[PDB]
């Protein structure tokens, strides 16, 4: 009658609002909405900071382009937001930090384009390395920030055993970690199938084996976007359309304040 649809949503957090008119409902991972540490689950004893609206708001990462030969993209959280406004500052000034997230992936095209993206949110997304040496990807390479990384179609082993790259080599049909991509659907996910929807919204609780941890040392969630069905349009052979990822911290609390961490990335 007045017209509410699970295809049209507005998300408002802090000073930022997102609208979509072609959603496919939204996922709350494992059925758990984010929340703060309860006193009976608390572990550091100092009073936490809770910046609230200053950090729990939508940050848009740089857009990536989906073309016919794209194999996929991945980001880790909190890493993709390490340089985002006051979320990054609080993350680096405190030994411990905890946060849930709303992830909104945006990709519009037209009624004559086709393709389907799988958007998966993976707890502890360990990725495989590029060489004979095990567990050797370096901190700077494992953590690309908002730039994220990419998937490949095959294992290209780094051979310069002299000046090893120490990078991940995520093969796409193996989900970058030795399992088959088809089973990634056991993880919280949505599909952006261009004939049906133009966005995916997934709410992520904080998941870890601890109530709070070091955000600088450990990524809690990985976001993997892979073309389940490749992009195609009319009869053109080089169609490209943007994919934009907007993520908002939720229920952020931090403990253990001191001087700022300055990681060496370069």
């Amino acid at each position: 009658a007045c017209g509410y649809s699970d295809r049209v949503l507005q998300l408002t957090l802090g000073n930022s609002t997102i609208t979509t008119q072609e959603a496919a409902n939204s996922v709350v991972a494992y059925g758990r909405w984010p929340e703060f540490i309860r006193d009976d689950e608390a572990n550091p004893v100092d009073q936490p900071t809770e910046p609230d609206v200053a950090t729990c708001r939508f940050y848009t990462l740089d857009t990536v382009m989906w073309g016919k030969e794209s194999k996929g993209w991945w980001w880790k959280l909190p890493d993709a937001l390490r340089d985002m406004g006051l979320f990054g500052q609080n993350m680096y000034y405190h030994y411990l930090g905890r946060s849930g997230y709303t992830v909104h992936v945006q990709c519009n095209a037209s009624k004559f384009h086709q393709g389907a993206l799988g958007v998966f949110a993976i707890p502890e997304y360990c990725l495989a390395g590029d060489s004979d040496k095990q567990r050797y990807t370096s901190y700077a390479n494992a953590n690309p920030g908002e730039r994220g990384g990419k998937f490949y179609s095959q294992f290209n082993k780094d051979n310069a055993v002299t000046s090893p790259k120490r990078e991940f080599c995520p093969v796409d049909y193996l989900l970058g970690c030795g399992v088959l991509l088809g089973n990634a659907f056991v993880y919280p996910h949505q599909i952006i199938n261009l004939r049906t929807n133009n966005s995916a919204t997934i709410v992520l609780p904080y998941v870890n084996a601890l109530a709070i941890d070091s955000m600088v040392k450990h990524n809690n969630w990985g976001i993997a976007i892979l073309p389940l069905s490749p992009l195609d349009f009319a009869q053109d052979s080089s169609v490209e359309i943007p994919i934009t990822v907007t993520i908002a911290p939720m229920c952020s609390e931090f403990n253990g304040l001191r001087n700022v961490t300055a990681p060496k990335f370069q």
Binding site: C2, G3, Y4, V8
Partner: protein, 62 residues
């Protein structure tokens, strides 16, 4: 025939409802001063002159 009304006080002295008094001295109402105690209204006749006015949270086109 004195009308007594309250003033809306802006700056206050370090001293409450302060009143002022008015008497009309002329028979013709055109001679009167303006009372400036003016009511307002709803802009809807200009901002929403729709036959079915819909609520802002619902879709405008259903």
């Amino acid at each position: 025939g004195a009308q007594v009304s309250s003033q809306k006080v802006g700056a206050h002295e370090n001293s409450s409802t302060i009143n002022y008094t008015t008497i009309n001295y002329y028979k013709d109402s055109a001679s009167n001063a303006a009372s400036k105690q003016d009511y307002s209204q709803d802009p809807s006749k200009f901002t929403e002159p729709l036959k079915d006015v819909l609520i802002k949270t619902a879709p405008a086109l259903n």
